[PDB]
Amino acid sequence: PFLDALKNHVGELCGETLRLERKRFLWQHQLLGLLSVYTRPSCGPEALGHLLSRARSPEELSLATQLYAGLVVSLSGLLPLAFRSCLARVHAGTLQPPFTARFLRNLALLVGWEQQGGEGPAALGAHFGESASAHLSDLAPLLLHPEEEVAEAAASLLAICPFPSEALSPSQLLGLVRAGVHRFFASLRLHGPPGVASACQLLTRLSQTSPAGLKAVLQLLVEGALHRGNTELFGGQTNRRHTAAVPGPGGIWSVFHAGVIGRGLKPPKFVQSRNQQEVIYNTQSLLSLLVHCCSAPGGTECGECWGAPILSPEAAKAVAVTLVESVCPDAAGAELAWPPEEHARATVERDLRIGRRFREQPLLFELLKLVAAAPPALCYCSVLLRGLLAALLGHWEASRHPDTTHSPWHLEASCTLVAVMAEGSLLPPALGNMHEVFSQLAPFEVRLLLLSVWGFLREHGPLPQKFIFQSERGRFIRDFSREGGGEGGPHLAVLHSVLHRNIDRLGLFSGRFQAP
Amino acid sequence: PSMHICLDFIPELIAQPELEKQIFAIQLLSHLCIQYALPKSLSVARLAVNVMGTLLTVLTQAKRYAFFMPTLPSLVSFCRAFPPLYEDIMSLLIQIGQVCASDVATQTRDIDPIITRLQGSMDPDVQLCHCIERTVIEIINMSVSGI
Amino acid sequence: AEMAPYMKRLSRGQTVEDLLEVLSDIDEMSRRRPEILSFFSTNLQRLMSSAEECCRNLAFSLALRSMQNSPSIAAAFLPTFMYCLGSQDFEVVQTALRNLPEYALLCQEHAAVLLHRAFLVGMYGQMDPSAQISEALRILH
Amino acid sequence: LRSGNYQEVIQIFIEDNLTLSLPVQFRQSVLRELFKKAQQGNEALDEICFKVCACNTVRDILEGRTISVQFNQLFLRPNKEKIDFLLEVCSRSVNLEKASESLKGNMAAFLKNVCLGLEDLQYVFMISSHELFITLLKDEERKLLVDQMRKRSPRVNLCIKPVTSFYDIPASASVNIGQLEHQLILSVDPWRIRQILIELHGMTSERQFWTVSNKWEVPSVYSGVILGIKDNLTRDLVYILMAKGLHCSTVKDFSHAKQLFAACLELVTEFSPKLRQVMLNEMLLLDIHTHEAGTGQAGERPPSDLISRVRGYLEMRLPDIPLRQVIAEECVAFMLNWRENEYLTLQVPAFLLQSNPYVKLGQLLAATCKELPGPKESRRTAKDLWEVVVQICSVSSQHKRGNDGRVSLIKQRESTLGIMYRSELLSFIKKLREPLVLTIILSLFVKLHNVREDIVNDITAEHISIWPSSIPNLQSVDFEAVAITVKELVRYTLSINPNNHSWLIIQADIYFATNQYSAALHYYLQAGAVCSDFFNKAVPPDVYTDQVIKRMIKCCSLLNCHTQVAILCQFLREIDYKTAFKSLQEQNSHDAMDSYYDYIWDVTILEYLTYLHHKRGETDKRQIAIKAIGQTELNASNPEEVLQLAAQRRKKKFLQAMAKLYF
C-alpha cells in the first residue's frame, strides 16, 4: 500500500530529492528507484522526466545519472520512453517554458558528456544521442518556438545531437534545414554574430550528410538571405477637419479647385540609414557559414599549415544556379556562348532590372566573389554577368561629364566586375589588370574598353570544358595560350592604344601591362 | 435603437461591386446580429457567409488580404449570435485557412508558418494566417464560455 | 492480483497477434466491471501510437470507456492524445480526429487546446475536421 | 615582384597599412596575381599569399569594407603561427597614440568577431592575452567574451555508481544480508558477484539465493539444466551470471555481458559438457549481437572466424543440446545478410536442414536471389518461395471448421500450414537488413497482395515481376493478413533506409489504394526528392512514369486542388487537356488558384483559363492570365532550346514549392 499510495506522489518526491537535503535526498533517491522497480509501468520515464524538468545543476544531473545506473540493470529501454513522454508533454500545455528550456539544456549537457569522455559514458551505456536521433523530427519545431530560451536550448542540443544509422529521410532533412535557416536569421536579428554559432554548427553538421542536403542548405540559405525581409540587415533598401476650414473663404460661392488626382503627397519619402557598421560583420558571418558548407573538409591538410582547402565546384554550381533563379528567372539568353553586342539592345530591359537589383543589394557582389573562388561556377553564372555588363555599357554612354568619378557607384561596379572576372580566370591577367585604371579615364574610354572585353570574351566563350582538372590540386585550371587566340592580341592592342593616348596621367600605371 | 432597419437593405448593400462597401456591410451585420437575433437577421447572416465563400473563389491575393483581414473578426460575432449557423462558419474558416496556407509556400518566406502547426510588419499572407488562428482561438473561447 | 498476468503480457508484447488477443480478452472482461481498466492506463497510452487499425480502435474504445467510468482521468490521456494528433503517419491522426468529439466532451477543460490543435492540423495538413469540430462545439453549446 | 623579394613586398605592404599611399585595387590585383602564382604550383608562395592577404584584410578593416572570402578560406584552420602573424601585423598597423576612436573600435570589433569565429580555447586565450587586444578591449568585454567561448565546455563530472544508503557494519545479520544482496544485484563484475555470493552462502545456511531479485529471468528450456547442479553455491553463481549477462545483452551492454559470460564459461567448464556447450551457444549469440551492433550496421567486413564457427555449429547439430530457435534464426539471418551465397543449398542439404525450417527458407532465399542475375527464365526457386509463402498464408481448412468467419488466422494464428507462421516469418524478416533480398521478398508479397485481392485493380509498381500468376487455393489465402504483413514490411524497410525510391513508390501506392491521398502525395514527393537532389536536376521518368503522374492527377483531383492538377498535367508526354479542363471547370478550388498561374507554362491551358475567367466574369484574374500569356519567355515559336529550359525551370520551382507545402 505504501508504494501504491506514493505512486500518485512520485513527482513531488522527485522535487524533494532535488531540494538536496542532507541525506533525505539520498533516501528519497533510493525510494524512487525501488518504487520504479516495483510498479509494472515502473514510472521510470516519469521520474526521470520530472527530475530533468526541474534539473538545473550538475549535482542534480548526476543524481539522475545515478538513478539511471541503478535502474538499467533491472529494466531496459528507459530513454526512448522518457524522451517520448517528455516531448509529448512539452508539446502539450504542460512543461512551462522555463521547465522545458531547463530540460532541453540538461539533455544537451547529457549528450555532450556522453560524446566526450571515455570512462563515464563507457561505464554507463545510455546512448542519449542515439535515442534522440529517433526523435530528431519533432525537435525541429522547438527551434521556431516563440520563446528565445527554448529556441536557444533546442539549437544547442541539435548542434551536437547525432543522426541515426541512416543519414535522414528527405522530409525530415527539409524540416530541419528550414528550421535551421529560420533560426539562423532570427539569431542574427536578435543577438548578432556572437549568438549564431550553434545554428551555424547545426547547419554545417547536417550539410555534409548527403549532396542533396548540401544543395538544400545552400539554396534555402541564399534565397532567404536575399528575401525582402532580413535584407536590410545586409544591404539596405477626417471630415471634421475638412469642414473645420472650407468653402473657398467665400461661403456664398463655389470652391476653387475642381478636384484631386488621388491620395496626394505620397508621405513617406523615407530613407534607410540604420547603420553602415557591423553589417560588414553580419555579412562576414554569413560568408563564413557558406565557406564552411561549400568547402569539402578534405582532411589532407594541404601544405604544412598554409594550403587552404579547395572549395567544392558542385557547391559553387548550386550557389550559381540558385542565385540566377533568385535574381533573374529569365532564361532567354541562357546560351552560355556570349551573343554579339547588338543583341543586348533587345535585352536592355532585363539588363536594367538586374542592374537595379544589384544596386539595391550589395551582398550579391560578395556571393559573386565566393563563386569566383571556384573556377567552373562562373560558366554557369554567365547571364548575370552579361546583364551587368550590358547595364554598365548602356549607362556609360549617357555620361556627359568629362570625368568618370562623377558617377560613383557605377565606377565601383565596373571595377568589381572586371576584377571578379579576372579572379574567375575568364580573362588573362593582362586584362585582369584592366580594372586598376578605370578611375582616371573619360567615360567613352571605359565604354570602348568594356566593348573590347566583350569582344574578347565572345571569342573565348566560357564553357565547362577547358577547365582542366589537376591531380596535384583539385582546382580546375584553364590554360591560356592554348585557345588559339591566347592573349588579347587585337584587344590588348586597343588597351595599349588607350593607355598610350592617356600617358598624361597613366605613365606610372603603364609599367604593369609590360609586354603580354 | 432605430437602426434595426438596416437588415432590410444589407442584402442590397452587399451586391455593390465596391470591396469597401462589402467589407463594411459584413462588419455592420456582425453587430446587428449580436444586438438583435431575429429570423430575418439569420436569413441574412447565412447570405453573408455564402458571399464570403464566393469572394474566396473570386478574388486575387492582393485584394484577398485587404478584404479578409478586416472582416474575419466578424465571424465570431455570427457564431455568438447563431449556434445553428456554425458548421458553415467552420467549413469556410478551414477552407480559407488552408487556401492561404497553400499560397504561402508558393514564394519563399522568412517565418514559414507551416512549422507553427505544432504549436510586426510581416508578409500579407503570414498576417492573414495569424489572423485566422486568432479568430479560431476566439471562436473556441466564445463557444466554451457561451453556455 | 487476478489481473497480474495481463499487464505483463501487454508490457512483454511486441507482436500484433498476441497484442490483439490480449486486447480482445481485456475487452471481454471489461464489459463486466469496466473499472478494472484503471490499471491499464499506462498500457493503453504507449500502444495508442501503434500502426495497426484494430489495435488503435481497441485502444480508443478502452480509453473512452475508462473515461466514461472515471471522468477525472482526462489529464492522464491528454499528452498522449496530443502526441497522437501531432504524429505524421496520417493514420493515428485520422483515427484521433474521428474520435475527437467524445474525448473533448469528457474533458470539458482543455477543449481550448484540443480544438485549436485539431484545427491547425486540418489547416496545414489537407484534412477537413469541419464536421468533427462542429459536432464537438455544438455539444459543448 | 619582378625579382622575388616577396618579404620586402610584405614589409612594404605592412608599412602601407599605415601610410595608406598604395591603391587598394592595386593591392587586390597583386594578391590575385600571387595566388595565380601559387596555383601554378609554387607552394613556397602559399604562406606569402596568406601574409599579403592578412595585410590587405587589416588595411581594409581600417576603412570598414567587406571581408574577402579568400581570407576566410585561408583562415578555415588557423595555426599558432598564422594568428601570431596577424596579431603582429595589427600591432604595426595601428599606433595607439595617433589613432582615432573609430579605428580603435574597428580593430577591437574585428578581433572580437575573429575570436568568435575561433574554436580552439588555446587560440582564444592567446588572442585575448595579446597586449594590443587587452589595450583596445576593456576588461569587462574581454571577460564577457572569454566566458562566452568557455560556455561551450561540457566539462561536467557525473556520478555513475549507484548510491548505497545502507551503512557498513550494521551489527545485524539480517540487514547485513539485505545490503549484501543489494550490492550483488547492483554488481556487474562476475568476480565480485562470485565473492558476494560465496560470502552470502558462507554466512548463511545452504539456502538458494538466486531467488533474491524476481526481475532476473532464465529461459525455461535451460532452467532445468542450470538448476540441476548439486552444489547450491555453483548453481546460484551460474544462474546469476547467465541471467545478468542475458539482461545485459537485451540492453545491448555487450561490454559487460562478455565479461560475465566469459567468467561463467570457465566455471561451467569443470562441470558437465552439456552446460558449457549451451554456454558456447550463448557465446555464438552474443558474438553475433556484438558484431551487428557494436561494430555498427556499417561493418565493412566480418572477420569470418565466427562465420565459420556458425557454419560448423549449424552443420554439426550432433548432440541433444537444447537449441534455441532464436539462435538458429539469428545466425541464418546473419549469413544471409552477409551474402554467404557460397553456403547455398548444396552444403549440408539434407542433414536436419529440412528439420529446421529457418535454414531451409534462408537457403531457398539465397538460391532464388542468386537466380535473378541468371537471365534464364527458370525462376524455379522463385516458384518454390511463392508456393511456401502462399501455403503459409493460406488457411489450412478451407471449410473453416474452427469458426465460420475467416478470422482464425488473424486471431487463433492456427490453420497456418507451412514451415513458419506469419509472425515467425515476420520475426525472421525483421532480423534482416539486406536491401536485395528484402526488396525481392517485398516484391513477392506485393504481388501476392495485388493478385485479385479486391475489386480495385490499382496494381502497385514493382521492379521484378517474376512470380507465378496462377493462384491455387485462392480462397484459402487471407488478403487481409497479406495487407497487414506487407504494410509492416514496408514500414520496416523504410526504417532501414528511407533513401530508397523503389520502396517509397510501393508505400505510396499502398496508401493510394487505402485512399490516404495526403500520405500518397507526401511519399510520392519524397520519392521524387530522393531520386533527384530536391529537384535541382531533372527527374528521371523511370520513377515518375506516366502511371505515377496519373495517380497524382487522381489524388489531387480527389484532394480538391484543381489548379495543382492542371500544373501536373504538363508532366506527361502528352498533355491531358480533357482532364485539365474538367478539373479547372469546378468552382471548389482549395489551392490558391491565382498564385499558381506563374508556374503553368503551356499556352493552350492559359487560353482556356482566360476564356473561363472572362466568361464567368472575373477580371482580376483574367488580367493575371493575360499577363502570364504575354510573358515573352514562352511563345510556342522559339527554337525550343529556350522552351525546354523554361519548362524545366518552372517544373523545378513548382515541385520545390509543392514539396515545401506537404511535410
- Cβ of A432 within 8 Å of Cβ of D663? The answer is no
- Cβ of B112 within 8 Å of Cβ of A141? The answer is no
- Helix C16-30 vs helix C4-11: crossing angle, to nearest 10: 150
Which residues on chain A are in Cβ contact (under 8 Å) with C11? 40-41
Which residues on chain A are in Cβ contact (under 8 Å) with D65? 280
Instruction: Give the CA angle between residues C47, C53, C54 to the nearest 5°.
Output: 80
| Resolution as reported, in Å | 4.2
Neighbours of chain C (3+ CB pairs under 8 A): A, B, D
CA–CA dist D460, D448 (Å, integer) = 11
Query: Any CB–CB contact under 8 A between D559 and chain C?
Result: yes
Instruction: Give the CA angle between residues D594, D596, D598 to the nearest 5°.
Output: 105
Query: Any CB–CB contact under 8 A between C12 and chain B?
Result: no
Query: Any CB–CB contact under 8 A between B66 and chain D?
Result: no
Residue from A210, A135, D631, D561 nearest B105 by CA: D561
Amino acid code (one letter) for A328: C
Alpha helices in A341-442 (DSSP H): 348-360, 363-373, 377-380, 382-397, 408-424, 429-432
Amino acid code (one letter) for A62: S
* A184, A200 contact by CB (below 8 A): yes
- Cβ of A175 within 8 Å of Cβ of B115? The answer is yes
* Closest Cβ–Cβ partner in C116, C124, C141 for B137: C116
Q: How far is CA A408 from CA A239, A277, A359, A415, D25, in A?
A: 48, 20, 12, 11, 15
Q: Burial of B90 by CB count in 10 Å (0-12 exposed, 13-18 middle, 19+ buried)? A: buried
**C109, C114, C123, C127: best to mutate for the B interface, most B CBs within 10 A:** C123
Which residues on chain A are in Cβ contact (under 8 Å) with C86? 91, 138
CA–CA dist D507, D489 (Å, integer) = 10
Q: Which of residues 113-142 of B touch D (CB under 8 A)?
A: 114
- Cβ of B119 within 8 Å of Cβ of A182? The answer is no
DSSP 3-state of B110? coil
Instruction: Give the CA angle between residues A175, A178, A184 to the nearest 5°.
Output: 135
CA distance C69 to chain B (A): 23
CA–CA dist D473, D470 (Å, integer) = 10
* D599, D567 contact by CB (below 8 A): yes
CB-based contacts of D245, cutoff 8 Å, min separation 6: D256, D257, D260, D261, D264, D282, D286
Characterize A375-386 residue by residue with b for buried, 16 or more Cβ atoms within 10 angstroms of its Cβ, and e for exposed: bbbbbbbbbbbb
The region, left, alpha or beta by phi > 0 then psi within -120 to 50, assigned to residue D252 is left
Residue from A176, A272, A289, A183 nearest A231 by CA: A272
Instruction: Give the CA angle between residues A399, A400, A402 to the nearest 5°.
Output: 100
CA–CA dist A334, A382 (Å, integer) = 8
Q: Any bridge partners for residue A311, and if so which? A: A295
Query: Any CB–CB contact under 8 A between B105 and chain C?
Result: no
- Cβ of D592 within 8 Å of Cβ of B114? The answer is no
Query: Any CB–CB contact under 8 A between D413 and chain C?
Result: yes
Q: CA-nearest residue of chain A to B111?
A: A182
- Cβ of A182 within 8 Å of Cβ of B112? The answer is yes
Query: Any CB–CB contact under 8 A between B145 and chain C?
Result: no
Residue from C81, D214, C1, C23 nearest A4 by CA: C1
Residue from B106, A99, C25 nearest D654 by CA: B106
* Closest Cβ–Cβ partner in D70, D533, D633 for A330: D633
Residue A266 CA, distance from chain mean position: 36
Query: How many CB atoms neighbour CB D28 within 10 A?
Result: 20
Mapping DSSP onto H, E and C, the string for chain C reads: CCCHHHHHHHHCCCCHHHHHHHHHHHHHHHCCCHHHHHHHHHHHHHHHCCCCHHHHHHHHHHHHHHHHHCHHHHHHHHHHHHHHHHCCCCCHHHHHHHCHHHHHHHHCCCHHHHHHHHHHHHHHCCCCCHHHHHHHHHHHC
Which residues on chain A are in Cβ contact (under 8 Å) with D186? 70, 73
Query: Any CB–CB contact under 8 A between B105 and chain D?
Result: yes
Which residues on chain A are in Cβ contact (under 8 Å) with D148? 194
Phi, psi of A477 (to 5 degrees): -120, 135
Which residues on chain D are in Cβ contact (under 8 Å) with B101? 661
Which residues on chain D are in Cβ contact (under 8 Å) with B61? 592, 594-595
DSSP 3-state of D477? strand
Extract long-range pairs of A298-301: CB within 8 Å, 24+ residues apart.
Answer: A301/D77
CA–CA dist A164, A173 (Å, integer) = 12
Q: CA-nearest residue of chain D to A347?
A: D632
CA–CA dist C1, D391 (Å, integer) = 42
**C8, C15, C17: best to mutate for the D interface, most D CBs within 10 A:** C17
* B92, B33 contact by CB (below 8 A): no
Method for structure elucidation: cryo-EM
* A306, D50 contact by CB (below 8 A): yes
Query: Any CB–CB contact under 8 A between B106 and chain D?
Result: yes
Q: How far is CA C104 from CA B61, B93, C82, D252, D502, in A?
A: 36, 20, 12, 42, 41
Neighbours of chain A (3+ CB pairs under 8 A): B, C, D
* Closest Cβ–Cβ partner in D484, D516, D559 for C16: D484
* D263, D190 contact by CB (below 8 A): yes
* D98, D55 contact by CB (below 8 A): no
CA distance A116 to chain C (A): 32
DSSP 3-state of D356? coil
Dihedral through CA D241, CA D243, CA D247, CA D249, nearest 10? 60
CA–CA dist D28, D147 (Å, integer) = 37
Amino acid code (one letter) for B124: P
CB-based contacts of D231, cutoff 8 Å, min separation 6: none
CA pseudo-torsion sign D399, D400, D405, D408: negative
Residue from A212, A130, A137, A140 nearest A164 by CA: A130
* A357, A300 contact by CB (below 8 A): no
Q: Burial of D577 by CB count in 10 Å (0-12 exposed, 13-18 middle, 19+ buried)? A: middle
Q: Burial of A135 by CB count in 10 Å (0-12 exposed, 13-18 middle, 19+ buried)? A: middle
Q: Which of residues 105-164 of D touch B (CB under 8 A)?
A: none
Amino acid code (one letter) for A355: G
